[PDB]
């Protein structure tokens, strides 16, 4: 199962979504 | 209130720290 | 301005991305 | 060693704490 991180607000959510993507790349490299 | 799906627990914890920081930036 | 010390290309580039989001939260 | 320019002490300190967590992680 995925983990589900609670977030308030679409602004913050979208930022974290983008950073997540970068972190996942980092962790694979 | 939204829920961001995350695969790794390491990613999850880092995102949790960044979220805390983003929340506090909203004060400035 | 302050100047954050960073060692390593990868870390610098990640912090640059996180910096952008931190700063945009104000707006 | 590189220096990332940042407007404002609060953002700078936030980024320092994040850097330590990032470095720990990787």
Author numbering:
A (entry chain A): 360 to 388
B (entry chain C): 361 to 388
C (entry chain B): 361 to 387
D (entry chain D): 361 to 386
Task: Copy text from the publication.
The transcription factors p53, p63 and p73 play an important role in cancer prevention, development and longevity. The three proteins share a similar domain organization, being composed of structured DNA-binding domain (DBD) and tetramerization domain flanked by intrinsically disordered regions. Tetramers are formed via a short tetramerization domain that follows the DBD, with a short flexible linker region separating the two domains. Here, we report crystal structures of different p63 tetramerization domain variants, showing not only marked similarity to p73 but also small differences that may be important for regulating the function of p63 in vivo.
In addition, we also solved the structure of a variant lacking the C-terminal helix altogether, that is, containing only the structural elements of the canonical p53 tetramerization domain motif. Deletion of the H2 helix has been shown to substantially destabilize the p63 and p73 tetramers, and much higher protein concentrations were needed to shift the equilibrium toward tetrameric species. We solved the crystal structure of such a truncated variant of p63, p63(359–388), at a resolution of 1.9 Å. Interestingly, this crystal structure, solved in the space group P1, contained one tetramer in the asymmetric unit but with fundamentally different packing characteristics than those observed for the longer variant. The primary dimers are formed as observed for the longer variant, that is, by formation of an intermolecular β-sheet and antiparallel packing of the H1 helices. These primary dimers, however, pack in an antiparallel fashion to form tetramers, which is in stark contrast to the orthogonal packing observed in the full-length tetramers of p53, p63 and p73. In addition, there are small differences in the structure of the primary dimers, most notably, a difference in packing angle and conformation of the H1 helix. This helix adopts an α-helical conformation throughout, whereas the packing interactions in the full-length variant cause a distortion at the C-terminal end of the helix and a transition to a 310-helical conformation. Key hydrophobic interactions at the center of the primary dimer interface are conserved. Hence, loss of the second helix in p63 and p73 not only weakens the tetramer but also fundamentally alters the overall orientation of the H1 helix packing, revealing a high degree of fluidity of this interface in the absence of the H2 helix.
